[PDB]
Amino acid sequence: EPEPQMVLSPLTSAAIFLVVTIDSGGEDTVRDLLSDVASLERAVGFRAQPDGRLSCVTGIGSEAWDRLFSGARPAGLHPFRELDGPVHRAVATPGDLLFHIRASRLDLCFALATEIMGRLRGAVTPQDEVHGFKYFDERDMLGFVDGTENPTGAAARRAVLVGAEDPAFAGGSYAVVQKYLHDIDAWEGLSVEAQERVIGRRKMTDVELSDDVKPADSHVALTSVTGPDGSDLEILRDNMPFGSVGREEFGTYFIGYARTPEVTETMLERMFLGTASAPHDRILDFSTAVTGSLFFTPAADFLEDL
Numbered sequence: 001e002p003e004p005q006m007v008l009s010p011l012t013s014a015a016i017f018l019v020v021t022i023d024s025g026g027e028d029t030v031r032d033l034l035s036d037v038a039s040l041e042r043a044v045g046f047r048a049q050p051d052g053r054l055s056c057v058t059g060i061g062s063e064a065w066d067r068l069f070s071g072a073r074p075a076g077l078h079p080f081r082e083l084d085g086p087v088h089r090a091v092a093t094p095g096d097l098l099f100h101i102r103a104s105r106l107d108l109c110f111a112l113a114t115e116i117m118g119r120l121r122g123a124v125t126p127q128d129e130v131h132g133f134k135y136f137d138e139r140d141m142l143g144f145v146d147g148t149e150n151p152t153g154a155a156a157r158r159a160v161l162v163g164a165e166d167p168a169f170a171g172g173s174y175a176v177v178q179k180y181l182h183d184i185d186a187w188e189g190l191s192v193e194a195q196e197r198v199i200g201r202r203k204m205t206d207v208e209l210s211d212d213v214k215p216a217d218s219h220v221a222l223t224s225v226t227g228p229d230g231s232d233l234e235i236l237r238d239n240m241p242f243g244s245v246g247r248e249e250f251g252t253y254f255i256g257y258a259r260t261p262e263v264t265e266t267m268l269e270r271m272f273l274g275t276a277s278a279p280h281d282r283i284l285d286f287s288t289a290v291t292g293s294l295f296f297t298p299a300a301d302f303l304e305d306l
């Protein structure tokens with residue numbers, strides 16, 4: 001059986017997202033680190049178990065894949081597709097490697113990030129570093145509970161893990177990241193009932209709005225997608241708040257895992273380009289994407305065998 005990376009993590013209250021590019025000539029150093037990342041995760045995390053819940057998911061971008069590896073590629077691995085809507089744009093920004101580091105405490109994330117970046121010094125250039133923290137009641141920076149409809153258990157494994165459709169890459173996943181900044185001043189100008197019509201759920205109690213009050217351009221309406229065969233197309237999210245009070249920077253770091261980028265990209269198209277019923281996702285009137293990258297997160301045994 002292929003052993004996946006810790007894509008399906010228990011709930012964690014802290015994250016570091018590290019996105020780097022590989023410098024010309026840095027390939028050999030990167031390949032050595034990829035074969036050691038699971039060993040480093042154990043070295044940093046074991047002595048803080050069982051409450052540390054430290055994990056690192058490592059992702060490789062399309063262009064980086066072709067620099068690092070020869071032979072067969074994951075079937076759906078391509079650069080993030082830029083979406084140029086009438087009003088809103090999803091930008092593509094550079095990123096060769098993703099380290100999605102999660103734990104119950106920021107210090108465990110930081111210790112592992114330090115070991116990884118120590119091994120990659122001189123081989124990579126940092127593009128993005130975000131220290132994420134969840135609100136004590138799973139709220140995001142818009143004050144809504146965030147994670148509620150994530151798939152769990154068997155449903156989550158079926159939604160996120162590559163299987164027989166791409167058998168050489170079984171146990172992998174596709175991660176799409178986007179750093180969003182929120183216009184909190186504009187958002188806080190709305191009544192709670194208007195905010196609820198933007199999201200599609202009740203703010204305090206997190207109960208979904210009935211189908212007869214839920215707007216067509218609400219977030220939950222546009223990211224609810226069914227396949228030709230009537231099944232829900234699901235992704236696994238672990239959205240993390242971040243920011244800087246002095247710079248008035250209030251953000252949501254979006255990460256969505258799926259067994260094919262097609263599911264995440266269908267949701268992004270509905271959000272950014274809209275549908276018959278909806279010009280675009282109302283969440284984007286208060287949320288600006290400033291990064292956008294796609295990564296393949298290989299099976300753990302793929303990284304071990306380099």
Ligand code: HEM
Binds near residue numbers: 144146149223256
């Ligand atoms: C802009 C920052 C984002 C924020 C603050 C945000 C926030 C939320 C919130 C509050 C919910 C409702 C509760 C729940 O998690 O089930 C939700 C649901 C969801 N979001 Fe977003 N989200 C963002 C971006 C995205 C993006 C970019 C995608 C997909 C590409 C996405 C996909 C989903 C999905 C699939 C659901 C569950 C819908 C359902 O089936 O009920 N989100 N999000």
Ligand SMILES: [Mg+2]
Binds near residue numbers: 184186248
């Ligand atoms: Mg402002």
